[PDB]
Paper text:
The electron-confurcating lactate dehydrogenase/electron-transferring flavoprotein (Ldh-EtfAB) complex, the research subject of this report, catalyzes the endergonic oxidation of lactate to the central cellular metabolite pyruvate with NAD+ as electron acceptor driven by simultaneous co-oxidation of Fdred. This FBEC reaction occurs in anaerobic sulfate-reducing and acetogenic bacteria. The confurcating Ldh-EtfAB complex belongs to the bEtf family, the largest and most diverse group of FBEB/FBEC enzymes. bEtf family members are built up of a variable dehydrogenase/oxidoreductase core and several peripherally attached EtfAB modules. The EtfAB heterodimer is built up of an EtfAB base composed of the N-terminal segments of EtfA and EtfB (termed domains I and III, respectively) and a module termed domain II or EtfAB shuttle domain (due to its shuttling role between two sites far away from each other) formed by the tightly associated C-terminal segment of EtfA and the C-terminal arm of EtfB.
The electron cryo-microscopically characterized (Ldh-EtfAB)2 complex of Acetobacterium woodii at 2.43 Å resolution consists of a mobile EtfAB shuttle domain located between the rigid central Ldh and the peripheral EtfAB base units. The FADs of Ldh and the EtfAB shuttle domain contact each other thereby forming the D (dehydrogenation-connected) state. The cryo-EM structure of the fragile Ldh-EtfAB complex from A. woodii was determined from a sample cross-linked with bis(sulfosuccinimidyl)suberate (BS3), because multiple attempts without cross-linking failed. From 9,788 micrographs collected and 674,283 particles extracted a twofold-averaged density map at a mean resolution of 2.43 Å was calculated using Relion. The local resolution ranges from 2.3 Å for the Ldh core to 3.1 Å for a peripheral EtfA region. The EM density was only disordered for the N-terminal Fd domain (2-65) of EtfA, for which model building was impossible. In particular, the cryo-EM density at the flavin binding sites is highly reliable. The 255 kDa heterohexameric complex has an overall size of 150 Å x 100 Å x 60 Å. Lactate oxidation in Ldh is assisted by the catalytic base His423 and a metal center. The intermediary Glu37 and Glu139 may harmonize the redox potentials between the FADs and the pyruvate/lactate pair crucial for FBEC.
Residue numbers in the entry:
A (entry chain E): 1 to 265
B (entry chain F): 1 to 467
C (entry chain C): 235 to 467
D (entry chain D): 62 to 398
Amino acid sequence: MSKILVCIKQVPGTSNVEVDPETGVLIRDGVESKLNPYDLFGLETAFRLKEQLGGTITTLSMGPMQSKEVLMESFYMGADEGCLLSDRKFGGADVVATSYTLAQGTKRLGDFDLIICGKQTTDGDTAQVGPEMAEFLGIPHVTNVIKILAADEKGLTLQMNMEESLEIQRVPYPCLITVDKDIYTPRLPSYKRKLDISKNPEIKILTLKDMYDTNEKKYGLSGSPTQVERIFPPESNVEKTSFEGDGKVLAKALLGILTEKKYLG
Amino acid sequence: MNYKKVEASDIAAIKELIPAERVFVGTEIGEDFSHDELGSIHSYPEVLIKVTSTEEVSKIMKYAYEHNIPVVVRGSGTGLVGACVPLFGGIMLETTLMNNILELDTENLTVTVEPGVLLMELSKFVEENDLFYPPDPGEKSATIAGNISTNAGGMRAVKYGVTRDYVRGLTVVLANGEIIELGGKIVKNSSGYSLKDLVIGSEGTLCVITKAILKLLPLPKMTLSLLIPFENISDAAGIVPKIIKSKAIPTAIEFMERQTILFAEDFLGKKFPDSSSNAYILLTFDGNTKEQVEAEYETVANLCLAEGAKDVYIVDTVERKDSVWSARGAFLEAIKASTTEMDECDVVVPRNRIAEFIEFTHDLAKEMDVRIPSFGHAGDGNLHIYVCRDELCQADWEAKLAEAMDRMYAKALTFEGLVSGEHGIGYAKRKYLLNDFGTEHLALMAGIKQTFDPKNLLNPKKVCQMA
Amino acid sequence: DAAGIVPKIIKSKAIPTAIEFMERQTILFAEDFLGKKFPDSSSNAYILLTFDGNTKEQVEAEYETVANLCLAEGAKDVYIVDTVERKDSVWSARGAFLEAIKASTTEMDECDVVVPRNRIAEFIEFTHDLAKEMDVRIPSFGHAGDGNLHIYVCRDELCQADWEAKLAEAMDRMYAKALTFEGLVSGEHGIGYAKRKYLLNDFGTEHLALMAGIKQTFDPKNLLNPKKVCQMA
Amino acid sequence: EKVAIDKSLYRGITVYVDHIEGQIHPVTFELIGKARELAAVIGHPVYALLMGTNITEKADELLKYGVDKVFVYDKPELKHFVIEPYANVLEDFIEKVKPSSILVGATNVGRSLAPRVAARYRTGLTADCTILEMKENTDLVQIRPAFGGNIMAQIVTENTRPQFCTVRYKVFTAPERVNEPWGDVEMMDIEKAKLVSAIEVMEVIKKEKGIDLSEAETIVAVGRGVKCEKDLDMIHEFAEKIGATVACTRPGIEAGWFDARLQIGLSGRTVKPKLIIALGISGAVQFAAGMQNSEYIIAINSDPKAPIFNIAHCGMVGDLYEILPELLTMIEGPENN
Ligand SMILES: Cc1cc2nc3c(=O)[nH]c(=O)nc-3n(C[C@H](O)[C@H](O)[C@H](O)COP(=O)(O)OP(=O)(O)OC[C@H]3O[C@@H](n4cnc5c(N)ncnc54)[C@H](O)[C@@H]3O)c2cc1C
Ligand SMILES: Cc1cc2nc3c(=O)[nH]c(=O)nc-3n(C[C@H](O)[C@H](O)[C@H](O)COP(=O)(O)OP(=O)(O)OC[C@H]3O[C@@H](n4cnc5c(N)ncnc54)[C@H](O)[C@@H]3O)c2cc1C
Ligand SMILES: Cc1cc2nc3c(=O)[nH]c(=O)nc-3n(C[C@H](O)[C@H](O)[C@H](O)COP(=O)(O)OP(=O)(O)OC[C@H]3O[C@@H](n4cnc5c(N)ncnc54)[C@H](O)[C@@H]3O)c2cc1C
Ligand SMILES: [Fe+3]
């Protein structure tokens, strides 16, 4: 409603990734980086709410100065203004330090009625920056939203899914939401909006000097409780096994395989 | 005429030439070999032979020429006009066991393939070697020699052309068993009559292709698509001469109206990214660097916005490309899921007459109360048009299908177009070829089949035969 | 070395408009005919490319790709031919190869065999061994991008009985060698009346019976241009 | 340099019990057998946290798996999962008991509740881990897939306690039930100001829609080997034993037995499930092009020369009409004797 924040991230353009056995760093093929497809559902969810409520949409990103391209890309889809969080002291962060500097950049940008994070990224896959960010803001949060039933000017009626149920909740403003895959079809970036000025917005960059808590122990690698020790390809093996001898000689072998894979059938 | 039925003495003489595990007789034929994707005609062959070599084909054609038995060659059974159906039920040669890619010449940029290499496994093989086979028919499980015999073309024909432009050489077997090499690994050819260009498009009525040499291109790295909404199909088809004359040639130019897109949304379950418009133009640019692809689409996008396009949408991401091209790729299956049965028309018109023919099928659909969805390629004039049965009874459907097909093939005759641009004539479109071309034009075609096949054994009553 | 760079040029995705090979002995004919020297003839073989485009930066990305590729694969130099006067200094030499060969001989007879592109250099070196053995002059050029070779046998000062014996032997051995190389008789000029015997040597009698039966379909009374191409081969 | 913590203060490994109004998710029992394995390396006890409204009689079910203490919060505001009463209780539980590690499931409740409390303590949390290794200096070593499963990552949390980790379902096995249960339940309490929430739940509706084929990770596919349409009732009861979506080949569409959105192949859906069971399907190139990237392919076919066995990870040669009803009697056998 009115003020809406969308947290978007720049990811590798493809996830087909392998590591060199003794570099320790990712063998990324190139750098044709993109906005992640899970945040396109978060941008599209904001666009349907802006067409119903008439407010504004702010995009927020944390990364290097190369991450200004996905802020311009969200502008071509229809975002009103953007904000980068580029600083050298913010790098090397885990989820706890990323969701802290995203919540510190939110308080600097003023109040928002709704923060829309995506389900997950495509490089980290942790799916937990969103719930950690709403803890630092102190706002309620609902994850895995597949449907917005009502879009009242004070709050939302949401459909949060589980593995086997559909919870229907009435959450008021201000709040964070985490939409998941295929809530809507995301609109494409318009070339007609690209030819406006370059785009009207002019991304506002923030550093550690601009935050209300300007102390680098809580940001970057210093505020990260976790760290990677090693990264390695997953060991997978294809075994072709045949089974002959009819009757329940095959049916015990099929039930022996379905119980070993915990299907219990 | 004069066709000898296959008897048990012919089974024994065939099983001396071919191993008996590749000969199928009677109840071990299978229902899949009695038809193709046309579905109207059904006819079993008496013998099904899965050949493996050129010399095995020539020994069968020597036997059938001596004993007066008709022969129908079959690939994957994919063609839509009844061309591989054995109406007289003789020998059926089946080539999907010859799926070997024989040679990849990286110096001449050619590939030598056997008949029965699928299009999905040839294009996978050459793209692992940074090469490119440009013709892309919509079904990738088709035999390469089936693409040569039907002159199969597709989406990339506006920039690259069809299968005819990439056949360098052929090894064919005539009806009497003679093995003929037609082209080669050369590039220029001016030595005699182009017999190779007669085999391309002949649909197995002249000879049996037993080897093919295909011209390859270097593979482009980058690929970007553009989605351009328009007010109607007349504005969408009219931008295509301006796009090509701006020297930024797209790889694919596809028009899609809103009614066809609503079928693909119901079939896939996902909405189209923007369907606030009635007609669309879906472009594709390719190249080797990101900057020269960006110079190509920005030329057309700055152009298209100046002649009444509502917007230009950039489709630059593998997720965005799959959101737009799986809707276009499922146009045929969405039309099939919405009806009881349908029939297919694939007229090609002049490119300035695309919009008048699409608007004609809208007036024809309202007049006859049938559903006629349509799409096609706006860069070459080929229109894929479907008459849907919906809920008509069998007597009313056969009268409404015959009237809707006759008026669409007569209108494409008035527009100076042809009967088929992709799929061929076969068995289904024979009378429309006799309406378009005269009797003197088809007497030249029938006299050429009498030269290659004087006993009329290689695929009887197809294309020109009894039009 | 000149014919071998052509697969590496095309596979670098910068497709030239024209790929011409010219040796030094053919260039020396055009220098005497035009009265002007070639801009650089310190080498024995040359590859003459041409790129086209719509902007200067698009052509510049095309030719710098191939020029970096040629210099890394054993080329002595790469010369840029960019202005109108420079193009007319190089392409008027190539455009006058046919007239310079005719001006240097009494009469000639020609050959336009197409071979596979990887067999261009073996056929050009074969005509040098054939010219040295038969003591005739065989100048040659052609298009290095498709395999068509324009080959000329000159009579020079031979007497009339010795010329028809040497022309028949030089033409028979060149059309038989292009048969061994899996090429054809003609790639440009056609068969006509002159090359009918070599078409019957390349293609079989069953191949020419299909051609003769097609002419019997279009022309049953045999009135349209008889005894040409697939007739009396 | 860095200030150090004393890890002797934080001991015990807590399994957060996941449930929906009493009925416990099976990911809880798999974590108890993993916690009893990990805490035996260090000598710590194994705890269980319980949150709900009427579930205090479900506590000794946790005691029958070897859990040392079952802390039960049984307030009436904990009926449906709202985050603020659930995160305030889990923060209150850490302030009293001080565990060393907390293992929760990878369910949508556990992927939502665990980051809210890990950010409140500014402690580490790893997502959907597959391998858990305990060090004897009380450091959990969490191995997790990343980049969509294209690489694995080794994560450690050396300073902050309690270290959180979410564990993927059906990776670890549930232990055997103990014959005598030891340990106790501990009824806990919290003030009612911590249990208020801005979010209020309207209703919890069961999912009553059939999943599309491209979203399914288990699929039973039938072919021309199934003769009549009434034999699908034997197959439809088999696919719900393992939760599979029933799909078919193109002969199944031409007979009208299935919707056209249930066809696998080039003319249908391209699928990548975790498990596909092909029943009477010869592996033709139009069908196999839509399912060859499955992670596990079981094929049941009478002809041993079928092309499905060139790609099947488990190739069973035999008739399906005698295997599957006899296997369905083997479904009731070990389960209900
Ligand atoms: C291989 C690997 C493994 C890792 N494992 C862990 C781990 O186990 N635990 C841990 O705490 N950290 C881990 N990290 C660190 C962390 O996940 C990332 O380095 C980084 O913080 C991005 O967060 P994310 O991908 O987890 O975001 P996610 O939680 O996966 O994404 C959720 C949403 O948050 C928003 N968002 C996320 N990152 C940003 C950003 N930078 N700017 C703006 N919006 C954003 C987006 O809307 C996104 O859709 C790992 C990193 C790597 C490379
Ligand atoms: C869903 C769908 C989409 C399609 N999309 C397109 C498309 O976009 N463009 C298009 O052009 N076509 C399309 N087609 C049809 C196209 O003609 C066929 O896909 C293909 O060309 C036929 O190849 P086949 O191997 O399937 O041939 P078959 O049908 O088996 O054979 C077709 C003809 O070729 C002959 N033949 C086959 N092999 C030989 C041989 N070795 N020697 C001589 N004759 C031979 C047969 O006798 C018959 O005359 C489509 C078909 C389908 C079902
Ligand atoms: C253009 C085109 C596109 C196509 N696209 C698709 C597509 O997208 N998807 C698709 O599925 N098909 C498609 N097809 C059809 C494809 O050819 C089929 O895969 C094939 O023809 C039939 O598949 P099937 O294995 O179910 O039938 P069959 O091959 O006839 O099945 C019989 C098999 O089941 C075994 N069997 C029989 N009885 C039993 C029993 N009691 N117990 C165990 N095993 C038994 C037999 O041994 C044999 O292996 C397409 C066809 C064409 C021409
Ligand atoms: Fe087409």
